[PDB]
Amino acid sequence: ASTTMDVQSAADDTGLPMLVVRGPFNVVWQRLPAALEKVGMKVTDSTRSQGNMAVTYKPLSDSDWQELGASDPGLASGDYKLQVGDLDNRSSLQFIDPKGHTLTQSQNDALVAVFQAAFS
Ligand SMILES: [Cl-]
Ligand SMILES: [Cl-]
């Protein structure tokens, strides 16, 4: 078997979109910086005890998305915060803009393929 980790779209306990990834916090936290780099997300600061990563996102060119194997997920370039939650054998990933806005269901849905590619 491979190093890929399963990724699914979900909602948090208030109904807002997030991703759920099939491995524990300790694994997903450690894998994230190099996986994020593949999809144009640079970690600029992080706090593991709070589960939070600050990311700056530069979208891939049309050809690079093609190489990765997912198309541009329709996220705006710029800064995001990524919150990594402990769900025992799984982890949650929830992106916010700097105003605290969560992704749309469509963006969050589009990031499922992006992150399955990044972890591969
Ligand atoms: Cl750079
Ligand atoms: Cl760390």
UniProtKB/Swiss-Prot annotation:
GO biological process: Gram-negative-bacterium-type cell outer membrane assembly; protein insertion into membrane
Keyword rRNA processing in annotation: no
Disulfides per UniProt: none
Subcellular location: Cell outer membrane
Entry keywords, A to Z: Cell outer membrane, Lipoprotein, Membrane, Palmitate, Signal
Source domain of life: Bacteria
Example of a GO cellular component annotation carried by this entry: Bam protein complex
One MF annotation (Gene Ontology) recorded for this entry: identical protein binding
Family assignment from sequence similarity: Belongs to the BamC family.
Task of the protein: Part of the outer membrane protein assembly complex (Bam), which is involved in assembly and insertion of beta-barrel proteins into the outer membrane. Nonessential member of the complex that stabilizes the interaction between the essential proteins BamA and BamD. Efficient substrate folding and insertion into the outer membrane requires all 5 subunits.
Record's comment describing the protein's domains: Contains two well-defined domains connected by a flexible linker. The C-terminal domain may serve as an important protein-binding surface for interaction with other Bam components or substrates. In addition, contains a long unstructured N-terminal region, which is required to stabilize the BamCD complex. Only the N-terminus of this protein is observed in the Bam complex in X-ray or EM structures, most of the protein must be highly mobile.
Assembly, per entry: Part of the Bam complex, which is composed of the outer membrane protein BamA, and four lipoproteins BamB, BamC, BamD and BamE. Forms a subcomplex with BamD and BamE. The Bam complex has the shape of a hat, with the BamA beta-barrel crown in the outer membrane and the periplasmic brim formed by the BamA POTRA domains and the 4 lipoproteins.
Name listed for the protein in its UniProt record: Outer membrane protein assembly factor BamC
Organism: Escherichia coli (strain K12)
